[PDB]
Amino acid sequence: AAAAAAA
Amino acid sequence: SYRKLGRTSAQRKAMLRDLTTDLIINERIETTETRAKELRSVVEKMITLGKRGDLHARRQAAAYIRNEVANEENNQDALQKLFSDIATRYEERQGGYTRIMKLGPRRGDGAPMAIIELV
Amino acid sequence: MIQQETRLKVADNSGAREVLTIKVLGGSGRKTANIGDVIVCTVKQATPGGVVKKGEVVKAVIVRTKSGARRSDGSYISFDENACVIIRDDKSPRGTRIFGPVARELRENNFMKIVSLAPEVI
Amino acid sequence: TKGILGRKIGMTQVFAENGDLIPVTVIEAAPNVVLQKKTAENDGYEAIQLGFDDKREKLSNKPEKGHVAKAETAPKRFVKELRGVEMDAYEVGQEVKVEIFSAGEIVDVTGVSKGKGFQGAIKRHGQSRGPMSHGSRYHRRPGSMGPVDPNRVFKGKLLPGRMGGEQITVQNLEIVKVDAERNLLLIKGNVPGAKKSLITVKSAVKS
Amino acid sequence: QKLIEDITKEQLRTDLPAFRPGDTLRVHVKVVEGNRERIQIFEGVVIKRRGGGISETFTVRKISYGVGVERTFPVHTPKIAKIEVVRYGKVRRAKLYYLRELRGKAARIKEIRR
Amino acid sequence: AVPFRRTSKMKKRLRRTHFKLNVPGMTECPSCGEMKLSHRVCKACGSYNGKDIN
RNA sequence: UUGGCACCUCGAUGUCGGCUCAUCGCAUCCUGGGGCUGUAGUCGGUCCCAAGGGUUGGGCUGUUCGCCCAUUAAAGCGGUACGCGAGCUGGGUUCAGAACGUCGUGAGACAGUUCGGUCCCUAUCCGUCGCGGGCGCAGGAAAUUUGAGAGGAGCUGUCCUUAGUACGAGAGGACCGGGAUGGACGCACCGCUGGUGUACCAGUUGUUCUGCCAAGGGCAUCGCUGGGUAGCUAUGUGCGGACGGGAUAAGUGCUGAAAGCAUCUAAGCAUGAAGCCCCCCUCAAGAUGAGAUUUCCCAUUCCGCAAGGAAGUAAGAUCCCUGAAAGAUGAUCAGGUUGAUAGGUCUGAGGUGGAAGUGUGGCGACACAUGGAGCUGACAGAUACUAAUCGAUCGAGGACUUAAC
């Protein structure tokens, strides 16, 4: 995973 | 190269026509220095148009002079003023009909002001 | 200024009508050729009666461009169309007849038979 | 070697002996007065000083007036050295003119190129441009500064800055025509610099 | 640019007739084929007249074998031997870029006799 | 785009070395003074070489 | 590369493939120089020396890879967080929806497939690219410069001769040496070819205004359309990688002994590569090792007994102003009233294309003559008509030893 989807 | 003065080209033309005509009636106006430098060449070109005195030069000048009253209780337009007073006043002089005299900076924006007069 | 994927009409009696450029043969290299250069090309449209068929990968030399070819005397020449003549991998043309005007810059190369078969050399 | 230095006027075209058309650059480069001769026993090298385009006494300083007093001439705007000329062959105060160049010779032309101001990497370094579409927000930018491992940018990374105003030498140009009456040199090809700027024309390194 | 004028005044071709950018004329072009130099005639309408003194150029367009040919000469070149104006046309502008797409009668109805 | 460390007082004062502004080109007015900045009309007397032109 | 271990990070080290920019190592793809060949010549095979330069445009697939088309001198392998997301894209992986196949009673699951799916940051410091202000360089200045060092460039194809010669039964076919013409790249500049050119010229539509016709102005993308000066430009033009020196690598050797011979070596001499150090171009004395040449200004006044410190000034420079061949701003350059720096005026170049008014012909729309006319932004040459006024500020009195004077 390690998805860069910071909001 | 001419200046842009922070305006659109249509706004440039309208402001230059307004300043030219307002200098032509009131004979002494106070603007910024760069507006004076852009205005003086156009004003002496229009005085040169008034020098000829023919109908074609007057119709050329009518496309630039705005329709404001020049002399009160006489019904004189500015276009009549170029061909009646300014041309007869500057008949001998060959160019250099305006001078620019600098003033101090303005309070509100630090703009260097200048005095424009017909000489 | 003939490029890859430029469509040229074919100006001889070989049978092809429209051809599509595959590669300019000069160098590694350039993507543009003007006049007198040989290009590898493939036939897109052709007449039913002719030796050259549709889809054949052939070689052709450019004879006309709308780009202004410069000469040493300061003169310029340009056409209203791009045209080329198909050749048998040497500098001899397929067709027995050549239609349309032909630029003089083919004479600087050893392209004598295409110039001799041309109706007008400018 | 030989050379002379002057001002270029502009470009024109001249056809000569055939139908062929030649791009021609016009240079006013005469007269030049020898101001100072550098000697190896005093200066450490051999060179001559050439002065061009003399000016009014109001624009010249007292050291400038005293430096040209030895050559018996007016103070001059442009002074440059030529190295290495055939020593001696010229005395101090002798006028160098355009008759030293014949109209078939091969010369070196140098000068300060035209200024372009602070320009981006695409114009200054010829770098290729990013895509304008398919979602791309990238164009007209210099690129990645390099890898991660040195923790620094290597020296020589091409970046936007001021373009022009540097000395540019164009090699192996040909003189088309020489005008001894009007002090003009006609040179084949393009010459770096703007109009009425200083152009130095020296003989090429043959062969 | 008066110095450029004094340089190139000796090489101006003053025997050429004056022609407007909207008339048809024939150009006698000397070409070197080896060894004999034939003089081919290039009749066609003038399209361009771009000034500049010695840098003046003019463009002549003709239709040859169904393909239009545009050819541009400098005015004062020695390659042109003789210029004869065939007839004078009546045009409204100095650049005739419109008629290179108007084949064929649509150019004839614009290039009327003057 | 985030400062890693705060600027010390000495580095801030070194950066503020060139933040100062210069004395204007002010000269003696020949009519009254004092004083008058160069190439402008005097605000006191309204004169310029040397007529009262306001 | 696939692995093994789990040392560093889970109060975050963004992970594939592409775009942009590159740099480095040869275990070298080509180009350069060689040895052995079962190398007759061209083309080859293998092994050395060599990183200087260059190592492509597509079709398929998210793809690297791979296959194919067409070239090429060749389309080389790898490292740099499988280089590079505070430089860029999210097509695939890897969220939340919905399906197909399979498994599961089921909720649901699948390196099985498909459709769709929010990529933030105003740069503090070091780094890099440019531009300034100080102080130093034992007096103050204006110019011209040597070069310790550093950067840039470094690539090659095709054709003709030699010569259809050497070689070879033939087919085929040179090494070496000359001369042209190209590709890619780079540096300059518009004089041509074009592009652009929002204060240039003309045509034309709708509405409003100058009381009306005529003639014009405003707005409608610069209203639209056709051209176009200067400047900036490439796709345009000119030029470059040329000829060459020194020490060399792999090789080829000469004279020669250890070892009476032999021997490329242990001493002495060569020859030898697109490697190296120069010749080509550029920045360069903050090169604190601060260099060198030419030419000006001079050696005041007052305190401090010595060191030294204040005021005025010379040579010169600056503040302020007119501007661009320059330019974000500084800076640079041309100039400041014994002068052409800018604007205006006049005359021209170029551009546009035949102004207004009048007259003629026609019912009229319109055409013709006056007339290459009128108009013209930065392009030239003349001309002080206007503005660069008067003014002010900074700027040295030259330390001590040693040899001759």
Length of chain E: 114
Q: Is E114 helix (H, G, I), strand (E, B) or coil?
A: coil
| Nearest-nucleotide field for B45 (CA, C1') | G344
| Nearest-nucleotide field for D142 (CA, C1') | G21
Q: How far apart are CA D46 and CA D35, in angstroms?
A: 14
Q: How far apart are CA D135 and CA D128, in angstroms?
A: 18
Sequence ranges of the domains in chain C: 1-122
Q: How far apart are CA B96 and CA B84, in angstroms?
A: 19
Residue C12 is classified by DSSP as B
Q: How far apart are CA B97 and CA B113, in angstroms?
A: 20
Q: Which residues contact C87 (CB under 8 A, 6 or more apart)?
A: C38, C59, C60, C61, C93, C94
The CB density around residue F27, as the number of other CB atoms within 10 Å, is 13
Q: How far apart are CA D37 and CA D82, in angstroms?
A: 10
C-beta of residue D10 within 8 angstroms of C-beta of residue D201: no
Q: Do at least 3 CB pairs under 8 Å connect D with F?
A: no
Helix (H) or strand (E) run with residue B55 in it: helix B55-62
C-beta of residue D106 within 8 angstroms of C-beta of residue D204: yes
Interface test with E, best of C64, C78, C115 (most E CBs within 10 A): C78
DSSP string, C58-117: EEEEEEE-SS-EE-TTS-EEEESS-EEEEESSSS-BSSS-B-S-B-GGGTTTT-HHHHHT
Smallest Cβ–Cβ distance between C74 and the set E64, E69, E74 belongs to E74
Q: Which residues contact E49 (CB under 8 A, 6 or more apart)?
A: E20, E21, E56, E58, E94
- Give the type of residue at E96: L
Q: Is D163 helix (H, G, I), strand (E, B) or coil?
A: strand
Phi then psi for residue E72, to 5 deg, are: -115, 125
CA distances from F19 to B109, D130, D185, F12, F22 (A): 20, 39, 52, 11, 10
- Give residue B53's domain range: 1-119
Helix (H) or strand (E) run with residue C42 in it: strand C38-46
- Give the type of residue at B1: S
Smallest Cβ–Cβ distance between C120 and the set E64, E74, E100 belongs to E64
CA nearest to nucleotide G183 C1': residue? C27
Phi then psi for residue E55, to 5 deg, are: -90, 15
Q: Which of C100, C82, C81, C1 is nearest to E100 (CA)?
A: C81
Half-sphere exposure of residue E59: CA atoms within 13 angstroms, side-chain side: 19
Q: Specify which residues C9 forms β-bridges with.
A: C18, C83
Helix (H) or strand (E) run with residue D178 in it: strand D167-179
* Furthest-apart CA atoms within chain A: distance in Å: 17
- Cβ contacts of F37 on chain B, cutoff 8 Å: 104
Bases of strand G lying below 7 A from some protein CB: 12, 14-15, 19-23, 55-57, 69-75, 80-81, 83-90, 94-95, 118-133, 141-147, 151-152, 157, 182-194, 198-199, 210, 215-220, 222-223, 226-229, 231-240, 242-243, 279-283, 291-297, 315-317, 319-328, 334-336, 338-340, 343-346, 348-357, 368, 372, 374-381, 383, 385-392
The label of the residue with tokens 């039913």 reads: C48
The label of the residue with tokens 């008058």 reads: F36
C-beta of residue E25 within 8 angstroms of C-beta of residue E86: yes
Q: Which residues contact B1 (CB under 8 A, 6 or more apart)?
A: none
Half-sphere exposure of residue E34: CA atoms within 13 angstroms, side-chain side: 2
C-beta of residue D1 within 8 angstroms of C-beta of residue D203: yes
Interface test with C, best of D17, D20, D24 (most C CBs within 10 A): D20
Half-sphere exposure of residue B97: CA atoms within 13 angstroms, side-chain side: 29
CB-based contact C73 D21, cutoff 8 Å: yes
Q: Specify which residues D106 forms β-bridges with.
A: D174
- Mark residue C5 as left, alpha or beta (left: phi above 0; alpha: psi -120 to 50; beta: remaining): left
Tokens of E18: 């004056």
The label of the residue with tokens 């070196």 reads: D108
The CB density around residue D147, as the number of other CB atoms within 10 Å, is 10
The CB density around residue C45, as the number of other CB atoms within 10 Å, is 13
Smallest Cβ–Cβ distance between C79 and the set E42, E69, E74 belongs to E69
Q: Chains D, E: CB contacts under 8 A, how many? A: 34
Q: Is B89 helix (H, G, I), strand (E, B) or coil?
A: helix
The CB density around residue D116, as the number of other CB atoms within 10 Å, is 12
C-beta of residue C83 within 8 angstroms of C-beta of residue C64: yes
CA E66 to chain centre: 20
Q: Which residues contact D48 (CB under 8 A, 6 or more apart)?
A: D34, D36, D37, D38, D81, D82, D85, D90
Q: Which of D190, D150, D198, D199 is nearest to D11 (CA)?
A: D190
Residue D21 burial by CB count (10 A; 0-12/13-18/19+): exposed, middle or buried?
Answer: buried
Q: How far apart are CA F40 and CA F38, in angstroms?
A: 6
Residue D16 burial by CB count (10 A; 0-12/13-18/19+): exposed, middle or buried?
Answer: middle
Pairing of strands C16-24, C7-10: antiparallel
Tokens of E64: 């040859």
C-beta of residue D30 within 8 angstroms of C-beta of residue D6: yes
Q: How far apart are CA D28 and CA D7, in angstroms?
A: 5
| Nearest-nucleotide field for E51 (CA, C1') | G350
Q: What are the helix (H) ranges across chain E?
A: 2-8, 105-108
Length of chain F: 54
Q: How far apart are CA B28 and CA B36, in angstroms?
A: 11
D24 Cα to chain C: minimum distance (Å): 13
Helix (H) or strand (E) run with residue D179 in it: strand D167-179
Q: How far apart are CA D71 and CA D92, in angstroms?
A: 5
Q: What burial letters (b/e) apply to F3-25, b meaning 16+ CB within 10 Å?
A: eeeeeeeeeeeeeeeeeeeeeee
CA of D165 to C1' of G212 (A): 63
Q: How far apart are CA D181 and CA D31, in angstroms?
A: 11
DSSP string, D49-87: EEEEEE--GGGS-HHHHHHTTTTTS--EEEEEEETT--S
Q: Is E80 helix (H, G, I), strand (E, B) or coil?
A: strand
Length of chain D: 207
C-beta of residue F44 within 8 angstroms of C-beta of residue F30: no
The label of the residue with tokens 């430098």 reads: B37
Q: Which of B18, B49, B44 is nearest to B31 (CA)?
A: B18
CA distances from D142 to D115, D128, D149, D165, E7 (A): 21, 9, 20, 22, 46
- Give residue F50's domain range: 2-54
Q: How far apart are CA E83 and CA E17, in angstroms?
A: 7
Q: In what order do the strands lie in the sheet with D95-96?
A: D76-82, D47-54, D32-38, D95-96
Q: How far apart are CA D19 and CA D34, in angstroms?
A: 41
- Mark residue E79 as left, alpha or beta (left: phi above 0; alpha: psi -120 to 50; beta: remaining): alpha
C-beta of residue E24 within 8 angstroms of C-beta of residue E89: yes
Q: Is E43 helix (H, G, I), strand (E, B) or coil?
A: strand
C-beta of residue C62 within 8 angstroms of C-beta of residue C39: yes
Phi then psi for residue D63, to 5 deg, are: -60, -35
Q: How far apart are CA B28 and CA B76, in angstroms?
A: 18
Smallest Cβ–Cβ distance between C101 and the set E65, E73, E79 belongs to E65
Q: How far apart are CA C67 and CA C5, in angstroms?
A: 17
Domain count, chain F: 1
